[PDB]
Structure formats: structure tokens, C-alpha cells
Write a protein that binds this ligand. Structure first.
Ligand SMILES: NC(=O)c1ccc[n+]([C@@H]2O[C@H](COP(=O)([O-])OP(=O)(O)OC[C@H]3O[C@@H](n4cnc5c(N)ncnc54)[C@H](OP(=O)(O)O)[C@@H]3O)[C@@H](O)[C@H]2O)c1
Ligand SMILES: NC(=O)c1ccc[n+]([C@@H]2O[C@H](COP(=O)([O-])OP(=O)(O)OC[C@H]3O[C@@H](n4cnc5c(N)ncnc54)[C@H](O)[C@@H]3O)[C@@H](O)[C@H]2O)c1
Ligand SMILES: NC(=O)c1ccc[n+]([C@@H]2O[C@H](COP(=O)([O-])OP(=O)(O)OC[C@H]3O[C@@H](n4cnc5c(N)ncnc54)[C@H](O)[C@@H]3O)[C@@H](O)[C@H]2O)c1
Lengths: 360, 174, 358
């Protein structure tokens, strides 16, 4: 059995579905491991370091994938309709594991279905204790939380910590975190490390205890809530939003668009030089002024909406994505046979499998 | 000239006090004694004592020196006060717990007009009921000058490492 | 008297030499305080917030400066020889307080002299205890140290802190700070609180204590220059290298040769804070991020201005602290005493003639 990992071709993608550590466990698992030349460049993973773990290097994308019984990609493969046709390079009847984005990308599902390829969309991992080590939304969003604060502090023209000085006191930044999920908790941690005062809020009551244990103070006021709650929330939020220096929005709802938490009129009330980091921008934004891939400036407030934020920490994000994949795949290699058999009753397998052998 | 006390002496003084304002300096940073210090304060205020921190603008060897270290030690921001808003509180403080500071308290900034430290604003620790100074020896600070506050009626020298001495004071508090 | 604060016209200067808290004080000492419109926009200080503190808003720079007896700015005023004559806007016989860079900019000194202006180079403040509140070298450098770490982390493709997660563990970033003045100590502290392992090196011996007082490890150990091998041993393991070493009037020391950067691991970044004086790294280029041998070498100019919203209040305070002891009763006038070491060490020209020894 061969497993292959290409370079990521989509604009801005510096992540890679591989690391030296993972190559080693895969060689010991029974695979030969091929990796495209320079596929690890953006994650600071070199070819020589992949070789010493025991993989081979292929000169091109086509050569990596051509005899591969299983392919590992970070993002979904492009189609002819997008430019280069990657689906076409994957061998007939191979298996494909990646962030396929399958529910909102039907042309990629039908392109693979035609080449007999079996695809497992990591992002549809069922949310259960034992699948936490396989979860890619979690590993990647956690890193996005850290980066949200690093991107805030860079765009911000004041410093984060309090400092009593001979020339006066630089007060501490005040940070406010809509949504306290994986990325929510990491932005609070990191903002606290830099010496800010950190407010947070959520529709989930269990999250209050988590905020208080990290050193944040919770704002008393996941499914669609309604318009009546959004008003109680905006009013309760307003006192703190008005003294807030950075504001990180992270809120998502399965299926539906991202909840508006900071409207136009609210930003109108924030201090000049304030910053909003919208991690939910690729889903419509928690702030409607945000636009994917750019920094809007409006009312003296900088609304930042980078895309694929995990790829802005690609050297940490890569080795953790590749372990998500190794954890998903390891339970289904039987002891000494060089074959892949996914149990099917295993809900890890069923909830993530989109197409297999010709049919959906 | 100079009365010297021990961990156990300083424990009795602050345990039998209503108000204590801690006053950190470079010495605290060198010894890295923030964590022991903050533990002393939260066993101090568990006893009902009222506890503040008084930060001199030029404590340590950089701006915000005391601030980063108290922040890593999880000191609440609401307990930490700048010179100008806390200097009048010393009048009503039973103890000024000076740990690793020296220049920051020396009143030769007010008095001796030939002094290198002259004109500098200082923390008024002398106004407290009694001052506990922690340092290893009788050496000067940065400024190369002696501190009169050392050898006077209501002052107490605690001779050791700031981390060790504070740890030892937390021990004797029970 | 009247005191006026223009907008900084030099490219990339977002700072301003005022703040609302300082305007309130200047009125309190008897000044009518004018500031040019749009001057505080870089520092998130609006004209609304200035007017409320007691300040009048002039419409152009020249109008602001025309009857001003005192003038405050952050960077030295431009001459006609650089295309904009700002010294010409300053009133004959007036006082200018700013970061003049007087020991290295003789043309601006002389252009001020012709107009019979008294200029007080703030950078030439004497290193005494009571001058700490007047000292712009430390207040502005301190912020640059902070910001160095923020720019390094922005450029770095990994997280500073160690992270133990369900999917695995990613190790902390390692940071090496060359030079341990004010900027490098704040760099050490900001890298430290973000979770990085932090190393430092400095040719002054008594720096070791300083570095450990912030939780960093000092790089320790005829021709004692096998110390270079101790530096090279860490630098080879380093993610972010921040170099802060300057020498007033001279070019910066080279601390990371092109030779050392070739032995560095890929994905590494060098933040050269000495870039305006030629860099501690000769590969650094002012105002840009050059890449070579896999390493991003970052060299932003005017780093205090990348934190202009806190940098400016502190600068403004330095100026007020320098000026306040010299205001007196007599129908609102400032009277600068020669006896004061803070005035004689800082003054550079006085009514038609250059006065500073250098
Ligand atoms: N913060 C800044 O930006 C900055 C910058 C440059 C200069 N300065 C100057 O530095 C001074 C700071 O004043 P400060 O009062 O904080 O400190 P200081 O005046 O220098 O005195 C610090 C004291 O700590 C003691 N100490 C050193 N190591 C210790 C240890 N491990 N355990 C316990 N004590 C220890 C020292 O005496 P022993 O050795 O006897 O224990 C020393 O007397 C000011 O004069 C300021 O002007 C400040
Ligand atoms: N395998 C697993 O067991 C697994 C995997 C992933 C997440 N989780 C859990 O799910 C929880 C959510 O994490 P997530 O990051 O995936 O969530 P998410 O990315 O889907 O959403 C982010 C947060 O925004 C909040 N939010 C949504 N609408 C809001 C509103 N209108 N106002 C305020 N907040 C709003 C949500 O409560 C959520 O916490 C976490 O506590 C995590 O432990 C479990
Ligand atoms: O206090 P400050 O802010 O005024 O400091 P500073 O502005 O004077 O500069 C930074 C520090 O770097 C030091 N330095 C000079 N040459 C060096 C070299 N070759 N290697 C390492 N360090 C060097 C200086 O002594 C100085 O303290």
C-alpha cells in the first residue's frame, strides 16, 4: 500500500497534510510514503527531514498520486472548472482523506464519484469524546484563536499590557470575545498572557465557568436564538463594547449563516483605533462590515477578516492536521496485511464517508 | 544603628496589622519572588488584612518591570496602584512591606540636594507604622547611595534572598 | 503664552506631540494651546477630544505655528533643503521642543538659528534620576521592544506558547534577543509572557542579572571570542531573533552576519531594530521584509510609530515634565534656567547663535 501527500495549490494555503513524526508511524504501519517536492515549504517542513523519517520524494504532484492507494490532502482538490484538475491525478479507486467541504461543494463530490474514488471528509467528524483526536475543526480553530489575538495586536496602535512608567501609565488593552468555543478559549488565554483585561460572552451557560478559570469576566445576558435575544445581548454588551479596544468574534451555527453580534450601529460607538477580528468571516461574519481577505476601515475601527486563519500558523497547524488524519486511519489497518478496511458500523467511518466506489 | 529581623519577626508584624502595602523593586525581580509574594498577600488578606501594591514608575530596570512579574504571578489589576494615587495611603498603613526596592523609597530624593537621586519622586514608605525592607546585604541600589531609612526607629532589615525570605515568611504565617 | 503642536509631516510618522490629559495641564499653567487639525489621527486622538480639554484647532500648519511662543513636535522639523520648510513656519525667537537629532543633523540646527529660535533637543536629556520623567529615549524605545515581539510573532508561522492538545503537542517558540537595553528587556518580557523560551546575549557583563530578572537565560560559556560559538549554538535552534544594539552617531554593530543566517533554520525571522543605523544584520533593508536562505529579515522604520496611540501620550508627558518647572507667575511666561543641568545639557541654539559644545 502507498500513501501520498501533495503540495496545496489553492491560493494562500501553506499547510501540508504531513510531518516527519507521522511518516514514521505510517512506515511502521505498513505504508510507503510519497510526498511532493517542496510540499512542506510553508509549514517549515523540509524534504530532507521527510526522507529521514522514511518517505520518498516525488518530483511532481502527478507522480506522487499515480500509484497511491490512499491520498492525504489538507484542502479539497480543485476541479477542471477551477483551473488545474487534481481529482484527475488521483488513481482510480483510491481513498481520499481531507477537509473536503463536502456539504457546500457538490462539484468536487461528483468529480471523485466518477473516478471511483472513496472520499472521507474530515470536517464531518461526529462530535464525540473518542473522536477528539481526529477532529480537524478543533485543532485548526484552536490555533486560529491564538492567531486572532496576534492579528489584533499587530493592527492595534497601542500595546496590550499595563505598564507603570516614568512618563505615565500605559493602560491595559480591553478585549471582548464573542463566542467562547475552542477558538474563543484560546483567544482569551492569549490575550490574558499579553496582559489585557478580557470580557467574554456566549449563549451557553457552561462556558461561564471556563471564562472565569482563564481569568476573564463573563457577560451575563449552539442554535439560532432569535431577534429578541440579539437585542438583550446588544444592550448588555454595549457598556463593555464601548470601552473595548479589541473585539474577537468567533460564533458559528451549523448549517445557518454566522450570527450578527456587532452591527453597523454598534461599531459606530466603539473608540477610534479599535479593532475587530472576525474569524467567522468565511461564513458571512459576526460583523457585516467584514469582507473576506481584507481589512475594512470604517468609523475609525479596523475590521479584519483574513481567510484560512489556521494557514497563518501553518507550521503548527500542519503537524496537528496530519495527526488528526493518522488517528482517523490507524484503527482500521489490521495487524500485518497491508490493507485498509473501514468498519462502517464505526460512526467515525459512516458520518465522514461521502462517496465510495462509484456511488454516494 | 540598624535593627535586624527574621522571617518570624516579619510574620508577627503583618499578621497583627489591619493594612499592608507591598512595595516591590528590582530585588524582587532578580530573585523572581513574585509568586511567593502573591501567596503571602492572599494568606494575608485571608486573615482579613487589607492589601495593596505600590509600584514606583522606575522600579526594576525597565518600564513595566513590576507589572509583568505581578501579572505572571496572577495579581489582580485592582490591587495594583501607581505612585501618584497611592502615596497618601501610606499614612494609614501599619506596614510598608518593601521587597527588593531601595532607591524607590530613599527620602534623600526630598532632602539631600547634592544627591544623585535628588528631585526624583519617591514612595512615602516612612509614613507607614513600620517598614520591612528585604535585601541580602547593606549595599546601595542603582544610584550608589545609602538609604537613611535603614537605620531609623521604625524600620526593620530582613537579610536574605527575596524569594527565600518571602517563602519563609509564608511558612511562619500558618 | 501660546503653544502649538503641528501634524508630523515626515513619511510614516503617525505620532503627535500632544494628548488631551496634557492639554488640560498646559491650560492650567496659563497657555492658550493650539494644535493643527488631523495631527492626532495616527494616534487615535480626534480633534473633538482635543477641543474638549481646552485646545483650539488651527486649519493649516502655518496658522497653528504663526503666533506660537512654544512649539512641540515629535521629529525634527523639515528644512527647505528637503523640500518643505517647516522651520520657516516657526515664529522668530520662539521655543521648539522635540526629538531634534541635533548631533547628527547640523542643517536643521542652523536653519533654526537663522530664525533665532531656541531649540531644546529632547534626546540630549541628561541621565539623572529626576530626568526620567522627561526621557523620550526610554519611553519610546520601551514600546519598540514590545512591538518587536508583536511583529516577530506576526511573521512567525507557529504559536509562541507550548500547546498540549488532543491532536498532539506543538513546542514553544525560541527567541534570542541581542542587546539588553530598555527595548530588549521589554522584548524579553513580551516574548516571555507569550510562552516562548527566551535567550539573550549582551557584551556588558552586569546584563546577566537583568535578563534573569525577567525569566530569560543569559548566554554564558586569550581570545574569549569562542563566545561566538555559544551564540551560534542557540541561534541555530532559534525561531525569532530580535536585535536591538545601537551606538549613537556611529553605524550599528553587526551581530548576525550573513554567514550566521545561513546556518539558521527555515521559517526563522530576524527583527532588526537597528535597521535605521545600518542594522545588526547587514541583510536587513529599511522598510521591508527581505527573505534569504529561508529567513525573513524584518526591518521596519520608526517602530515607536507602529504603537503611536500609546507612544504619543508618553512623549507628550515627557515634554510637559521638561517644561513645567519653568513656567512661573509673571503674566504667563517661561523662564529657562541655565543652572538647571536639564536645560543646559539639552539646549542647542539660543537667539541667533549655536550654544551646545558639539
Ligand atoms: N525601571 C527602569 O526603567 C530603570 C532603568 C534604568 C535605571 N533604573 C534605576 O534603577 C533603580 C530602581 O530602584 P529599585 O528601588 O527598584 O531597586 P534598587 O534601587 O536598585 O535596589 C534594589 C535592591 O534589591 C536588592 N536585591 C538585589 N538582588 C536581590 C535578591 N536576589 N533578593 C533580595 N534583594 C535583592 C539589592 O540589595 P542587595 O544586593 O543587598 O540584596 C538592592 O538594594 C532606580 O534608581 C532607577 O532610577 C530604572
Ligand atoms: N469531538 C468533540 O466532542 C467536539 C469537537 C468540537 C467541538 N466540541 C465542543 O463544542 C463546543 C463548541 O465549540 P466550537 O468551537 O466547535 O463551536 P463553534 O465553532 O461551532 O462556535 C463557536 C461558539 O460561538 C458560540 N455562539 C454561537 N452563536 C452565538 C451567539 N449568538 N452569541 C454568543 N455566542 C454564540 C457557540 O456557543 C460556540 O461556543 C466546545 O465547547 C467544544 O468542547 C466538541
Ligand atoms: O538602555 P538603552 O535603551 O539606552 O540601551 P541602548 O539604546 O544604548 O542599546 C542597546 C544595548 O546594546 C548594547 N550593545 C552595544 N554593542 C553591542 C554588541 N556588540 N553586542 C551586544 N550588545 C551591544 C549597548 O551597550 C546597549 O545597552
Amino acid at each position: 500500500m502507498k500513501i501520498a501527500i501533495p503540495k496545496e495549490r489553492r491560493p494562500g494555503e501553506d499547510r501540508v497534510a504531513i510531518s516527519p513524526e507521522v511518516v514514521k508511524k505510517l512506515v511502521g504501519l505498513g505504508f510507503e510514503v510519497i510526498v511532493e517536492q517542496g510540499a512542506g515549504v510553508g509549514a517549515s517542513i523540509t524534504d530532507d527531514a521527510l526522507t529521514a523519517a522514511g518517505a520518498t520524494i516525488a518530483s511532481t504532484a502527478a507522480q506522487a498520486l499515480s500509484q497511491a492507494d490512499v491520498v492525504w490532502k489538507v484542502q479539497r482538490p480543485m476541479t477542471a472548472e477551477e483551473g488545474t484538475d487534481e481529482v484527475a491525478l488521483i488513481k482510480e479507486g483510491a481513498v481520499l482523506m481531507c477537509h473536503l467541504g463536502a456539504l457546500t461543494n457538490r462539484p468536487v463530490v461528483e468529480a471523485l464519484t466518477k473516478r471511483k474514488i472513496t472520499a472521507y471528509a474530515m470536517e464531518l467528524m461526529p462530535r464525540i469524546s473518542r473522536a477528539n483526536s481526529m477532529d480537524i475543526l478543533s485543532s485548526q480553530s484552536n490555533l486560529a484563536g491564538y492567531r486572532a489575538v496576534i492579528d489584533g495586536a499587530y493592527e492595534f496602535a497601542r500595546a496590550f499590557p499595563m505598564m507603570m512608567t516614568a512618563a505615565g501609565t500605559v493602560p491595559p488593552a480591553r478585549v471582548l470575545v464573542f463566542g467562547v468555543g475552542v477558538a474563543g478559549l484560546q483567544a482569551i488565554a492569549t490575550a490574558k498572557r499579553l496582559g489585557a483585561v478580557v470580557m467574554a460572552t456566549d449563549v451557553r451557560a457552561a462556558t461561564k465557568e471556563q471564562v472565569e478559570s482563564l481569568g476573564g469576566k463573563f457577560i451575563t445576558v449552539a442554535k439560532e436564538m432569535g431577534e429578541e435575544f440579539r437585542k438583550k445581548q446588544a444592550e448588555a454588551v454595549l457598556k463593555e463594547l464601548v470601552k473595548t479596544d479589541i473585539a474577537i468574534t468567533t460564533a458559528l451555527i451549523p448549517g445557518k449563516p454566522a450570527p450578527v453580534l456587532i452591527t453597523e450601529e454598534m461599531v459606530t460607538k466603539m473608540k477610534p483605533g479599535s479593532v475587530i477580528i472576525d474569524l467567522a468571516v468565511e461564513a458571512g461574519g459576526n460583523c457585516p462590515l467584514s469582507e473576506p481577505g481584507k481589512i475594512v476601515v470604517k468609523h475609525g475601527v479596523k475590521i479584519v477578516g483574513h481567510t484560512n486563519v489556521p494557514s497563518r500558523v501553518a507550521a503548527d497547524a500542519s503537524p496537528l492536521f496530519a495527526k488528526n488524519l493518522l488517528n482517523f486511519l490507524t484503527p482500521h489497518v489490521d495487524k500485518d496485511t497491508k490493507t485498509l478496511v473501514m468498519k462502517l458500523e464505526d460512526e467515525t467511518v459512516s458520518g465522514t464517508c461521502v462517496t465510495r466506489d462509484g456511488a454516494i | 544603628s540598624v535593627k535586624a529581623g527574621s522571617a518570624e519577626d516579619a510574620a508577627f508584624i503583618m499578621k497583627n496589622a489591619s493594612k499592608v502595602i507591598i512595595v516591590p523593586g528590582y530585588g524582587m525581580a532578580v530573585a523572581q519572588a513574585q509568586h511567593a509574594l502573591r501567596e503571602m498577600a492572599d494568606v494575608l488578606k485571608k486573615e482579613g488584612v487589607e492589601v495593596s501594591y505600590a509600584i514606583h514608575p522606575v522600579a526594576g530596570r525597565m518600564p513595566g518591570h513590576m507589572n509583568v512579574l505581578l501579572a505572571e504571578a496572577n495579581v489582580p489589576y485592582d490591587e495594583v496602584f501607581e505612585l501618584e494615587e497611592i502615596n497618601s495611603s501610606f499614612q494609614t498603613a501599619d506596614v510598608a512591606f518593601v521587597i527588593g526596592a531601595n532607591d524607590v523609597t530613599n527620602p534623600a530624593a526630598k532632602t539631600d540636594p547634592s544627591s544623585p537621586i535628588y528631585g526624583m519622586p519617591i514612595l512615602d514608605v516612612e509614613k507607614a507604622g513600620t517598614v520591612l525592607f528585604i535585601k541580602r546585604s547593606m549595599a546601595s541600589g542603582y544610584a550608589g547611595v545609602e538609604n537613611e531609612l535603614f537605620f531609623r526607629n521604625n524600620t526593620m532589615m530582613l537579610f536574605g534572598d527575596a524569594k527565600k525570605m518571602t517563602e519563609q515568611i509564608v511558612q511562619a504565617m500558618n
